[PDB]
A = this chain, B = another copy of it.
Amino acid sequence: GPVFTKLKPWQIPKRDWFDKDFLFGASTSAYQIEGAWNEDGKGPSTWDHFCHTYPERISDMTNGDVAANSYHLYEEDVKALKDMGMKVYRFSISWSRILPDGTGKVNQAGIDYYNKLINSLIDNDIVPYVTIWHWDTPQALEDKYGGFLNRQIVDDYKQFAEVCFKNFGDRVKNWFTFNEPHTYCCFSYGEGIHAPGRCSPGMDCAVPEGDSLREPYTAGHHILLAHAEAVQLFKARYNMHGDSKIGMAFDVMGYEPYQDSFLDDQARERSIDYNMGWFLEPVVRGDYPFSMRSLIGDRLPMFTKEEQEKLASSCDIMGLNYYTSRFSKHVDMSPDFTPTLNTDDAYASSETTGSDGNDIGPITGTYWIYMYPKGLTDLLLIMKEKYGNPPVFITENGIADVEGDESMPDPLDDWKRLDYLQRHISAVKDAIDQGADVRGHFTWGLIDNFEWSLGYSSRFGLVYIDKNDGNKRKLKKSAKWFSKFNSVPKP
């Protein structure tokens, strides 16, 4: 209640199910764990600003001022990774901590911080996978020209990326330019629940002075142009040894047709195109999915010939952030339907319940994460069969334990998260068995952190952060399983 059946013991993945080269790790992002939001010269980001100006927009009225205080306690994060036997740590670099004014003078204190983290990871035999931007825009640029809604963001991002390549490229060999562009554009400029919090007039978000049918696409277009410029520069001047890789991390939901009919089959394809294709197809072929152009038209910016060429094949590795799936239900084009939110442009509504009336899968805690591992395997095979089978890493995967869930009284006894993770790791094995080029699995939530609009009410970590006991790191049941899974020598 809710009924949650666990895998039978012989169905639990073993490390040897994957080859020696496969990589298991965990992920975090700068604003979600660092804290020290105004320390040592760091400038404010769009999220610092959003939380400080519209605090009510965060469920529990919290923010990332301190978070898990990883700016000061990173050694404990490294320790947690080591204790679990993880071989990779995916983290992000705070743009505003490196370049307080977005552009200009680099903050040496910021550079020193990441060098410490990187060196500690390497000293502990953990490989760093770095996300350059994680919704982390310097408020200075937001104020100056509207951040990602202005073309200037392209060159400014490029210069930021270069600072990262020059200072950390000698040790960091795997990069992700952007994290979840679809999630970002949808929630930051469509619904407006995320910083900068914009939406169309009449809608309910912090700043209803935007356009939910246009700003999301404008921001996404600049993200892609920024990505293209950064990768071009990287391949030209920062991969001289030929052993570095750069890609992007996409948020992706699996989709099943709502009802067995060719109409929902078509709707399903539109959903995938909109959720995943929006940003994946451009980095693969140099243009947006045909479905999007045919439905969004003039509201979706056109790429020039050279831009399309720069974008095509601009990803060495593809990161997939997978949590759940939905049923795709066809919506007809008629005068009875008029798009108002960008998501309406797919003409396919995402449903949590199918035609037979059943939820797609068991709820896992937070309202939007329904467990459906099959969805991940399906997406991985699409990457294989449709997009050339490029190197794919599951850069995020996991569930949240929520405040107030009576079925989760002990924050360390996360058997549900463990079962979910084991099932998805098994789903990855299935994809690999079927030929998909999957190279790793990074659990989202090395540690509990700031879950954006839901604050700290949602705990996604393998490792508990005891907020009332000095933000102490405490291994949960899931974390202990990884220690065993990875054969970490015991004391």
**Could you name 22 residue pairs across A and B whose Cβ atoms are closer than 8 Å?**
A3-B353, A5-B355, A5-B356, A5-B357, A8-B261, A9-B284, A10-B387, A11-B388, A14-B390, A14-B391, A16-B391, A16-B437, A240-B490, A242-B487, A243-B487, A262-B386, A262-B387, A266-B290, A290-B332, A290-B347, A293-B333, A356-B371
Q: How many Å lie between the Cα of A285 and that of B335 in the bound state? A: 18
Closest to A16 in B: B391
- The smallest C-beta distance from A9 to any residue of chain B, in angstroms, reads 5
Q: How many Å lie between the Cα of A17 and that of B384 in the bound state? A: 12
A164 within 8 A of B: no
In the bound complex, residues from chain B placing their C-beta under 8 Å from that of A11 are 261, 388
Q: Categorize the interface residue count of chain A.
A: 35 or more
Q: How many Å lie between the Cα of A17 and that of B312 in the bound state? A: 19
In the bound complex, residues from chain B placing their C-beta under 8 Å from that of A490 are 240, 242
Closest 3 CB pairs of A and B: A10-B388, A242-B487, A358-B358
In the bound complex, residues from chain B placing their C-beta under 8 Å from that of A355 are 3, 5
With contacts A240-B490, A487-B242 taken as known, whether A3 is within 8 angstroms of B263 at the C-beta atoms is no
A122 within 8 A of B: no
A287 within 8 A of B: yes
Which of A2, A284, A330 has the most chain B CB within a 10 Å cutoff?
A284
A53 within 8 A of B: no
- The smallest C-beta distance from A422 to any residue of chain B, in angstroms, reads 12
Q: Cβ of A313 and Cβ of B3 under 8 Å apart?
A: no
With contacts A11-B388, A285-B10 taken as known, whether A294 is within 8 angstroms of B488 at the C-beta atoms is no
A362 within 8 A of B: yes
Q: How many Å lie between the Cα of A335 and that of B301 in the bound state? A: 11
Pick the residue among B266, B334, B390 that contacts A302 (CB under 8 A).
B334
Q: How many Å lie between the Cα of A490 and that of B10 in the bound state? A: 45
In the bound complex, residues from chain B placing their C-beta under 8 Å from that of A302 are 334-335
Q: Cβ of A489 and Cβ of B333 under 8 Å apart?
A: no
In the bound complex, residues from chain B placing their C-beta under 8 Å from that of A332 are 287, 290
Q: How many Å lie between the Cα of A263 and that of B362 in the bound state? A: 22
A295 within 8 A of B: yes
Closest to A292 in B: B333
Q: How many Å lie between the Cα of A357 and that of B2 in the bound state? A: 7
A259 within 8 A of B: yes
The contact string, 1 if C-beta is below 8 Å from chain B, for chain A 1-21, is: 011110011111010110000
Q: How many Å lie between the Cα of A476 and that of B294 in the bound state? A: 41
Kindly list 13 other residue pairs between chains A and B, CB separation below 8 angstroms, not including A9-B285, A16-B391, A357-B359: A2-B357, A3-B353, A5-B356, A8-B259, A240-B489, A243-B487, A263-B290, A302-B334, A302-B335, A356-B361, A356-B371, A358-B358, A358-B359
